[PDB]
Amino acid sequence: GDVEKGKKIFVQKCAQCHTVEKGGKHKTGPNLHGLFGRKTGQAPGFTYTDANKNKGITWKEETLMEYLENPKKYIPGTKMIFAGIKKKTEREDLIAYLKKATNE
Template sequence: MYSITVASDIKKGANLFKTRCAQCHTVEKDGGNKIGPALSGLFGRKTGSVEGYAYTDANKEKGIEWNDQTLSDYLENPKKYIPGTKMAFGGLKKEKDRKDLIA
């Protein structure tokens, strides 16, 4: 089981989001969609379910619920985890980076 620990660096995670994710995503409650879907309220949500965002069929049909583990697996290699996704991101190969980002 995947777990975020106190060893996760929230500051580093915020910087990773700013440099690797914020161009395409928002995390604010009313941030809205950009090139990618809004990420506010991500945990517990099903893939492909943000209203007003044009997902690929692959994202809509994946049918998983976002949690620490599924998000880490996705962020490691998005195109491998959801073949057919339009997310143009090569992934975060280091588990520590993924844990920091998710924290």
Template sequence: MPAEPNAKNGAKLFKTRCAQCHTVDEGAGNKVGPSLHGLVGRQSGQVEGFAYTEANKKAAVTWDEENLFKYLENPKKFIPGTKMVFAGLKKEKDRRDLIAFLKENS
């Protein structure tokens, strides 16, 4: 049985793997990537003022835990045509921890 997700570890992962392109704080706005504040439960391609690829807009994915888990393993496989250059998190625990952090900031 997998260990409980650790949002503190997820925060560290966000800082080292995501924060150069994304923000999570309310009102912080977009960077190279869209703001991830309120991500969990939102549909893909919906952040105001961010220029998404057609692939992202048309994916119509609702960002729940299951979809985030698959996406974070290999974004380009999950949404072919995305411009996100992130290669993904191969370790299941890292993905679960990052999702726990994103849920806390949604």
């Protein structure tokens, strides 16, 4: 496998949701450091879907190859969920901005 190319692909298709650095922060997705040898859905502090939580497989070259070709196929139920906004005043302020900008 070609590392330099893989780095570019990661930066374009994955970096937006995942960090790989040790101690890396969780974003939309979980930090991926120490991924090889780790079972699905074990990154401490992250909230996985039951699908990702129960896949029951170990991440490594082979599993990643199948998974990466089509995530939903390998782990039916895996998806990105649009983060809700629980605070009422925040939703009110956001809508006020939306009402103005989407109409100007």
